[PDB]
């Protein structure tokens, strides 16, 4: 009866956009797997924070399905996610089974690379808008958090808490999200 | 001409309160050393995020002095910081040379354990107030960020961005903090 989350961690990922959702989701009782794109080895994030993943993406792929797949941002991290065939397979499968897909900042540009969720309203970091909108396959939003169907997007490191709590609300409901939120000392 | 920051990382530390200041400070051009209390080995944080430190605290101690010493929160992380003699030596030295000391959430309780900054106005996480105020050696504040002399404190994971930007402003000034802040997409 426990929900499961997959966080895909690639070199150059924004470590704040990786750790906040993982932390907040585990506070909500969600079983989170931080899967290294390139294997089990430690991952050097965009600001040189080094994180040890829980598993390789190859191994975590076999232990699905997941209720949410989370794509952190970071320009170079998002590029690595966009070039990976394993990520394409995971996202297409998740879209087919109508599971939740969550991406923040530059992360949503991986959805375009893999042709995921065309026609959805999405947001990105302001600096990633032009890349996300190449071809006009999505409709752009400036909301700090945007959810259209099974596609949940957010804008930047400073929206990471709202992004993470939106996932919790989608998976575990509004009451759990509010309980998890109070001890964090968030402003609004 | 480069400012230097020391972040002391112990088991049970709150990984969000560790990664946000490190990331934000490196965005500000500050040279940050994430020093493992127990050595160079990876550190399991409070929500099971595993971080590889840049150096052992023993090694980082020799490469001082630092313009700021940063103590993350996390109840068990703060207890480990409070029991460490090496931390006592670093903090007392930092206080004598009138360097900045920054602690967030449960982190400020390590200041009480090591008799640092008595008489200062400080804040903590609401759940750590009673422990911080044992003996009445400080004056308590409910501000999200509190700075009294060389003691800078903050309340919780949700104040981590404001806590980190206050450090940048103290070290590099108000203009740099504002430049670093804009791309984060913070609300206020």
CA A180, distance to chain mean position in Å, is 19
A137 is catalytic: no
Q: d(Cα B44, Cα B30) in Å, to the nearest integer?
A: 25
Question: Rounded distance, CA B154 to CA B102, Å?
Answer: 8
Say which CATH number the domain at B170 has.
3.40.50.880
- The H or E element that residue A29 is part of is none
Would you say how long chain A is, in residues?
188
Tokens at residue A180, please? 């998890």
DSSP strand E in B84-125: where?
Answer: 100-104, 121-122
Residues after which chain A is broken (C–N above 2.5 A) are: none
Angle between helix A15-27 and helix B15-27 axes, rounded to 10 deg? 160
Length of chain B: 188
Sequence-distant (6+) residues with CB within 8 A of A12 are A44, A45, A46, A74, A75, A76, A77, A79, A80
Are the CB atoms for B145 and B151 separated by under 8 Å? no
Q: Could you list the active site residues of B?
A: 105, 125
A142: buried, middle or exposed (CB in 10 Å: 19+, 13-18, 0-12)?
exposed
| Nearest-angstrom CA–CA distance, A13 and A47 | 9
CA angle A146–A148–A152, rounded 5-degree value = 50
- Spatial distance between the Cα atoms of B126 and A185, rounded to a whole number of angstroms: 9
Task: Read off the tokens for A131.
Answer: 């890349």
- Name the helix (H) or strand (E) containing B15: helix B15-27
Enumerate the β-bridge partners of residue B104.
B154
- For residue A146, what are the β-bridge partners? A153
Expressed as residue numbers, the domain containing B9 is 1-187
- Report chain A residues whose CB lies below 8 A from the CB of B42: 42, 52
Q: How many domains does chain A have?
A: 1
Distances (CA, A) of B170 to A152, A182, B30, B153, B186: 37, 29, 12, 13, 19
Contact B185 A155 (CB under 8 A): yes
Question: Which residue blocks in A8-119 are alpha helix, DSSP H?
Answer: 15-27, 57-62, 75-83, 85-96, 109-113
The residues pairing with A100 across neighbouring beta strands, listed in sequence order, are A68
Bond into B68 cis (ω within 30): no
- Per CB distance under 8 Å, which residues of B are interface residues toward A? 14-16, 19-20, 22-23, 26-27, 34, 42, 47-52, 125-127, 144, 155-159, 161, 183-188
For helices A15-27 and A160-172, what crossing angle results, to 10°? 30
- Contact call for B185 and A19, based on CB within 8 A: no
The H-or-E segment that residue A54 falls in is none
Interface size, chain A vs chain B, as Cβ–Cβ contacts under 8 Å: 86
Q: Is residue B166 a contact partner of residue B147, using CB atoms and an 8 Å limit?
A: yes
Resolution in A: 2.1
Which DSSP category does A94 fall into? H
Residue A163: enclosing H or E segment and its boundaries?
helix A160-172
β-strand pairing of B68-71 with B4-9: parallel
Contact flag B19-A16 (C-beta cutoff 8 Å):
yes
Closest residue of A to B23, CA-based?
A: A47
Concatenating the DSSP letter of every residue in B119-158 gives T-EE---GGGHHHHTTTS-SEE---SEEEETTEEEE-SGG
In angstroms, the CA B36 to CA B32 distance is: 13
CA distance A69 to chain B (A): 18
Structure determined via: X-ray
Give the position of tokens 């929160």: B73
Taking the C-alpha atoms of residue B129 and residue B64, their distance in angstroms, rounded to an integer, is 31
Residue carrying the six token digits 């952190």? A72
Backbone region of residue B182 per phi and psi (left: phi > 0; alpha: psi in -120 to 50; beta: other values)? alpha
Bridge partners, residue A103, by sequence: A71, A153
Whether A105 is catalytic:
yes
Tell me the sheet residues that pair with B7: B34, B70
């Amino acid at each position: 009866a426990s929900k499961r989350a997959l966080v895909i961690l690639a070199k150059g990922a924004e470590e704040m956009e990786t750790v906040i959702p993982v932390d907040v989701m585990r506070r909500a009782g969600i079983k989170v797997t931080v899967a290294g794109l390139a294997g089990k080895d430690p991952v050097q994030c965009s600001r040189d924070v080094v994180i040890c993943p829980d598993a390789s993406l190859e191994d975590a792929k076999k232990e699905g399905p997941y209720d949410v797949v989370v794509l952190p941002g970071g320009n170079l991290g998002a590029q690595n996610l966009s070039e990976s065939a394993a990520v394409k397979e995971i996202l297409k499968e998740q879209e087919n089974r109508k599971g939740l897909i969550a991406a923040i900042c530059a992360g949503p540009t991986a959805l375009l690379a893999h042709e995921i969720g065309f026609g959805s309203k999405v947001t990105t970091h302001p600096l990633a808008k032009d890349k996300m909108m190449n071809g006009g396959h999505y409709t752009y939003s400036e909301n700090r958090v945007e959810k259209d169907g099974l596609i949940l997007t957010s804008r930047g490191p400073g929206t990471s808490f709202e992004f993470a709590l939106a996932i919790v609300e989608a998976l575990n409901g509004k009451e759990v999200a509010a309980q998890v939120k109070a001890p964090l000392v968030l402003k609004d």
